[PDB]
Amino acid sequence: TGYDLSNSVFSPDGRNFQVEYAVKAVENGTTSIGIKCNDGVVFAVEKLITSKLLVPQKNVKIQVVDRHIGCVYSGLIPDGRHLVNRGREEAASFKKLYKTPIPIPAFADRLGQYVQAHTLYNSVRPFGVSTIFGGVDKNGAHLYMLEPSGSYWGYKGAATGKGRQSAKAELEKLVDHHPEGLSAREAVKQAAKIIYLAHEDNKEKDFELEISWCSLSETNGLHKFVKGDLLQEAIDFAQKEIN
Amino acid sequence: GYDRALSIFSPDGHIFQVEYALEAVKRGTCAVGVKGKNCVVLGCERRSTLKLQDTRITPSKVSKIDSHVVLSFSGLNADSRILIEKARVEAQSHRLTLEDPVTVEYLTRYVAGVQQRYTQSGGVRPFGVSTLIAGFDPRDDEPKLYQTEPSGIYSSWSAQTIGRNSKTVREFLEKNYDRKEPPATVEECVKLTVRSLLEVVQTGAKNIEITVVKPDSDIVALSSEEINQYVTQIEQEKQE
Amino acid sequence: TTTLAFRFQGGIIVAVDSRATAGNWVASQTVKKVIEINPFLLGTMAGGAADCQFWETWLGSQCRLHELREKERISVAAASKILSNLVYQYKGAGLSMGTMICGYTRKEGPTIYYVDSDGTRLKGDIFCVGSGQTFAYGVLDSNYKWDLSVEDALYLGKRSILAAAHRDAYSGGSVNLYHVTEDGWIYHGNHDVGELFWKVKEEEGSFNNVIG
Amino acid sequence: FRNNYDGDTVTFSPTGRLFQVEYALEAIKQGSVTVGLRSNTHAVLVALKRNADELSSYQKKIIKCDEHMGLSLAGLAPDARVLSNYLRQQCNYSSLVFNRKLAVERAGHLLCDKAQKNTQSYGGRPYGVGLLIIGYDKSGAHLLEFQPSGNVTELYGTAIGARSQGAKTYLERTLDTFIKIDGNPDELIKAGVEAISQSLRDESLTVDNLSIAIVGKDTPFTIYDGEAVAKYI
Amino acid sequence: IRWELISRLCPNSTGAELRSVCTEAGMFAIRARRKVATEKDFLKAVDKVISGYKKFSSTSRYMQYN
Amino acid sequence: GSRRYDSRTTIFSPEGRLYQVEYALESISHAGTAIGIMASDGIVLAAERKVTSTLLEQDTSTEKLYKLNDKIAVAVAGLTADAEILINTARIHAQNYLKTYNEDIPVEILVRRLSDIKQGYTQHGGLRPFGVSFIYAGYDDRYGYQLYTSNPSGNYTGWKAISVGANTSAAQTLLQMDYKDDMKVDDAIELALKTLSKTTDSSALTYDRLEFATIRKGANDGEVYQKIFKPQEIKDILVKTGIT
Amino acid sequence: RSTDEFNGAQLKAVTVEAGMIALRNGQSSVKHEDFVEGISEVQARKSKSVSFYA
Amino acid sequence: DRGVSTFSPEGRLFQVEYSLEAIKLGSTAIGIATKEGVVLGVEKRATSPLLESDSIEKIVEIDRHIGCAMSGLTADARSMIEHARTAAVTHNLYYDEDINVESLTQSVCDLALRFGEGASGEERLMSRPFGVALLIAGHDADDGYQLFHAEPSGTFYRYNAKAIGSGSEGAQAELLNEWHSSLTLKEAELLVLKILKQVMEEKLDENNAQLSCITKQDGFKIYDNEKTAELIKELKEKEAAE
């Protein structure tokens, strides 16, 4: 009763309850996946068309940080955007002192340390977002997914949203089919497939698919949006597969 | 750090703490004020009666603010010390910057000012103090009597009473002080102020303190003998 | 830059010039060196122009805010001791102040106060500040009486600025008079300093010395 | 209505919910209706102005933020005063420093980011007002939806207020029509009247209680009122 | 007895309190020793029951929301 | 949220009283008893410790009697820790006045400023009121010998005698009978042991449960002396009034 | 169209509420003008208070 | 305790609802704005025959063409009068020109908004309140005589006439009949007293009433207590012709 009320007070048995509660917010959000490839990394999110009044490709939820790190999130959608600010502030701060873009493992650590503060004190609220962010630098590609607790892990692939289960089982099967790492050029196509399957869950409102990629081979380490003809080939490929 | 709101509005259109403020005043001592036409008289009863308790060095409940302003206070007595302090401060910073002593009007606003401004900040309870302010305007003869609230409101009065059992002495004053005809002299006023206190003091002259302020910085106290004399006079006449 | 003011019977006469130089170059000859602080105080402009104009408008604001606040109009002595204690704060920052604040109230009578940059604040009956501080004293003090007709007192002001204006380089332009009564200052207007010289040279018969 | 969670925005619920936000969302539906619709050369706002009784005057509901941009309030009138200042301030900051028209896209995202701070910190209420920001720049015409929650989305058309759905439904049947309206200033205003009449259910349409605002490719931000909206209607 | 006259003087009053002005003018007729309740016993009676039963708001609190 | 955890020391009750302050007046009456007696010829400041164990080094300790400066001594009732703060804050304030007027602080002043400090804890800032009361004993030229007491509320009154700590009502009635206004210093000493030997909760009044100090104008050339007696001179006057 | 967030029990509470309006006039047929006007008589709404600041 | 922060799931800040009660408790204040002279009259509600009538002030001067009448706790108002006085004079240093009447209302309304939690170094110097209304009345070139109604909400409207205080409901219903667009100064002054007489607790006298106007030539001017006693006397003649 009184451990339920409180923030940042340990339960008798030893767990924080409001970390657990903060997970709920991740499952309300829409699907998003990352796929780590041999070249770099692909990001993709399901953007729900909740009315005929929204405009197409103008209410983009994919947001870069610097010019080599893709970011898309699930949780509470204002609360996402403010962590994409925080990231920018730290990114930029590193470029002043050490004159080089920030390394991707380092980008992870400091971003995490912010989340961690809001479970240290009782006075601000534990952040209600699970994020995917990653990109390529000199060490290579890295994928990360950050949980509201303040924990990240590296991954061959990761996913988040209400349709995480349906993507997690295909993602094993894209570690079996291609055990040496598929090319990122193949993986535009493979990304679409995994959104079109995890849309039966959110089949309530029709969708619009968004991919983006950052890889050393294609885009010269510069994160971009897949657009025009390359976006048309991936759409028609996953649509005719799942029907 | 502490700024937690203590002026929680009452849904009935009030503020709980400002009622309580008025209550704490009622607990404490009594004090009466009356304005003749050339004097003011501040009497207050003193529970400093208690064999083996000095009165030379114990502080009286009527305080001197300035040469020609005097204050009397009912309510919490720990608290009284502050409003004296602030008013003294004021009285000098007025001379410094504008010249000329404080107009009694002005000093009234200013004490009133301080008590309001403790309901604004969260970190602080209201002063549970009401006061009588009296004096005579610089280079004039105009009696003035003012009284303020722990609300912060203020008004001049012909005579007033605050503290415990204020209803008895107000009801006494309605009959016995005409609004068109003040008591003529200084002795006739003082006889009238004693007679008001001797309703709630239940005789004795040792209890009550009577200070008079007149125009031209005349702040004087009546000593035990004088008090007794007046009391006795009121005794013979009343008896007869 | 001659500003003078003398107490007399009916109240105060203010009198000023209007030639305000910047260097050898004569900038402008229209500069009204009175500052109407409200309709019962008049404040002169001598010393540095910026520090003076601006800061007595700001004095004008504490007048419309003492006046509402007690509902009693500001005393002349009290107004001054505001202004003084403000510029004392900035002492040693090159701000340059020479004003007379003149008023007549019914609690103090006609009273001049002279506020100065050091913080010196003097009451007195005659003050005269600026370039024409010594010429102006001289003409004025012979002919000066505590008893005088108001009309004569206006003509005593003309002649005082006149004298400083002739001999001094930076005094010239036009003359201005004001007459403080209790009720307020009334403006007695502007006489050109080049028409005024020739009336008084002939009419009186002084300035023989001057050719023409 | 208490028990459970209804205290600060700090306390976070086992349901997944944050109550205070939802409460704040109820607030907009209290106020008076506003619609916003655009085409590629003109963006219009129509809002209903209201008065306390019939001696009282109407109330200003449409606010000109700048000569190319503006908002209209729905719900709390003290809150709208805080946030209209801050968009004056910021669009001034981009003409001083960078000499650029503050882009509608940018201006939404900045407001989102200010709202977030009020729900993370202890104390401070969530802002509880809704703004429909119209505006015209070099990217054509935009309309934005500010929810109290923080979300911004661009729409062709929307409404929010009292009995809004009556206006929202009309706007979808005709979606096909009003984007193809371009160049006729008159034809755009007059579509937007017939979109706000549906909301007026149990409410008569007055002509002096309606506030109308067009901005376009050649006209600055202009509010019509009084005689000028008695032409159209 | 204009029924508009006593209804004005009264503030916003239920009909269970507007029944009690008759009963308080009926108990004041007995004190004054009158066989008739008049328009004088109703003007006094208003003053007494409006003050009296107005003061003190039962609990003067309630709420219990937040 | 955090408002729940807030005690609200600051708030007034529906009595208008500060319930917190009344509690504090309690915590004094738990602590050992101290008695003030004014004489014309000196001031006898006398207080019986609360502590009592047989291992207490009485010679080494003061705990109830502190000097402020050379003219002014206080006797303490309450928590000793709390007190010690106030007692240093006093000592600095005494000295501050000496640097600025080369004229020792008048007794009225010093008391008034301590009283102001105390009050402030219960105005604002949700602090807990100090649990302390002092007897002030002090001498100047102005008024003569002066006695005062200040309580945790921040309100002080003068006196011709008074008692603080336990059995306050008991002490006050014993003094009401016995004190006459004329006493010497030696008779005043004898009334102090008399009033402490009845009230004592422990059976015997012993030289090592007592603290005694004097302030006498019987020091020649018009000078005042303090002296805190040793535990070995209080023993000599315990046999003098016959307590042993 | 003219209803929204009416559950089926309010809507039975509209068609009966319309045919009362027909019995008040005295009409024997309930027209399309009364079904509109019965919609405002049973909404689970009477508004808590006219707005003072929204 | 309710927060200042918290919402009532209706959508409402509990505290605003409670503030708007405090207006109604305080004493009656009528204002009628015509095209020829705004008249403000209030009931003093002298509480004892000992207390001096004229020390009490509830008609207050903001500057020399903006007069103002207050209803509610007069204390809360002491802070908000002073803020308004400064701001109007600040503008007169800064543009040498009369502050708009509408503009002055806005600055008062802005301080009214303040009552906030007082998070970080941010200055909200109140934590509570401002339970008082104003009848801010004025004259300027831009719009003729105006009259504005401030709330503690931070919400204001223009009004042709508005009553507030204890008898607001009754006064409101007589105003919707009597108000017109053809009123003269002399007719409005007598009409204010007639609507103020009905909801006055005591008999209409000048020892519990104070009248004032703002008229183009005069500016602000509160009336003499002698003038008012005469306008009382003339109301009863016209009424006793009927």
Swiss-Prot record, chain A:
GO CC annotation terms, alphabetical: nucleus; proteasome complex; proteasome core complex, alpha-subunit complex; proteasome storage granule
Post-translational modification: The alpha and beta forms are probably products of the same gene with different post-translational modifications.
Comment field (misc): Present with 12000 molecules/cell in log phase SD medium.
Residues of the full protein shown: 6 to 248 of 288
Role: The proteasome degrades poly-ubiquitinated proteins in the cytoplasm and in the nucleus. It is essential for the regulated turnover of proteins and for the removal of misfolded proteins. The proteasome is a multicatalytic proteinase complex that is characterized by its ability to cleave peptides with Arg, Phe, Tyr, Leu, and Glu adjacent to the leaving group at neutral or slightly basic pH. It has an ATP-dependent proteolytic activity.
Domain of life: Eukaryota
Single GO molecular function: mRNA binding
Gene Ontology terms: biological process: proteasomal ubiquitin-independent protein catabolic process; proteasome-mediated ubiquitin-dependent protein catabolic process
Cellular compartment(s): Cytoplasm; Nucleus
Similarity field: Belongs to the peptidase T1A family.
Record's protein name: Probable proteasome subunit alpha type-7
Record flagged with keyword Signal: no
Key words, A-Z: Acetylation, Cytoplasm, Nucleus, Proteasome
From Swiss-Prot, chain C:
Binding positions (bortezomib): A49
Gene Ontology MF annotations: endopeptidase activity; threonine-type endopeptidase activity
EC number: 3.4.25.1
GO terms of biological process kind: proteasomal ubiquitin-independent protein catabolic process; proteasome core complex assembly; proteasome-mediated ubiquitin-dependent protein catabolic process
Keyword Amino-acid biosynthesis: no
GO cellular component terms, A-Z: cytosol; nucleus; peroxisome; proteasome complex; proteasome core complex, beta-subunit complex
Active site: T1 (nucleophile)
Disulfide bonds: none
EC category: hydrolase
Record's keyword terms, sorted: Cytoplasm, Hydrolase, Nucleus, Protease, Proteasome, Threonine protease, Zymogen
Family: Belongs to the peptidase T1B family.
Oligomer status and interactors: The 26S proteasome consists of a 20S proteasome core and two 19S regulatory subunits. The 20S proteasome core is composed of 28 subunits that are arranged in four stacked rings, resulting in a barrel-shaped structure. The two end rings are each formed by seven alpha subunits, and the two central rings are each formed by seven beta subunits. The catalytic chamber with the active sites is on the inside of the barrel.
Note: The side chain of Thr-1 acts as a nucleophile, and the N-terminal amino group acts as a proton acceptor.
Name of the protein in question: Proteasome subunit beta type-5
Organism of provenance: Saccharomyces cerevisiae (strain ATCC 204508 / S288c) (Baker's yeast)
Lineage: Eukaryota, Fungi, Dikarya, Ascomycota, Saccharomycotina
Gene: PRE2
UniProtKB/Swiss-Prot annotation, chain D:
Sorted UniProt keywords: Cytoplasm, Isopeptide bond, Nucleus, Phosphoprotein, Proteasome, Ubl conjugation
Superkingdom to which the source organism belongs: Eukaryota
GO cellular component: nucleus; proteasome complex; proteasome core complex, alpha-subunit complex; proteasome storage granule
Glycyl lysine isopeptide (Lys-Gly) (interchain with G-Cter in ubiquitin), cross-linked positions: K190
Pfam family, one: Proteasome
GO biological process, one term: proteasome-mediated ubiquitin-dependent protein catabolic process
Modified positions (Phosphoserine) in chain numbering: S13
Compartments (UniProt record): Cytoplasm; Nucleus
Further comment: Present with 7210 molecules/cell in log phase SD medium.
Similarity comment: Belongs to the peptidase T1A family.
Function: The proteasome degrades poly-ubiquitinated proteins in the cytoplasm and in the nucleus. It is essential for the regulated turnover of proteins and for the removal of misfolded proteins. The proteasome is a multicatalytic proteinase complex that is characterized by its ability to cleave peptides with Arg, Phe, Tyr, Leu, and Glu adjacent to the leaving group at neutral or slightly basic pH. It has an ATP-dependent proteolytic activity.
PANTHER family in the cross-refs: PROTEASOME SUBUNIT ALPHA/BETA (PTHR11599)
Protein name per UniProt: Proteasome subunit alpha type-6
Organism from which the protein derives: Saccharomyces cerevisiae (strain ATCC 204508 / S288c) (Baker's yeast)
Curated annotation (Swiss-Prot), chain E:
Post-translational modifications: The N-terminus is blocked.
Sequence intervals crossing the membrane: none
Subcellular location: Cytoplasm; Nucleus
Subunit details: Interacts with UBR1 and CIC1.
Additional record remark: Present with 105 molecules/cell in log phase SD medium.
Function: The 26S proteasome is involved in the ATP-dependent degradation of ubiquitinated proteins. The regulatory (or ATPase) complex confers ATP dependency and substrate specificity to the 26S complex.
Family per record: Belongs to the AAA ATPase family.
Protein name: 26S proteasome regulatory subunit 7 homolog
Species the sequence originates in: Saccharomyces cerevisiae (strain ATCC 204508 / S288c) (Baker's yeast)
Gene from which this protein is expressed: RPT1
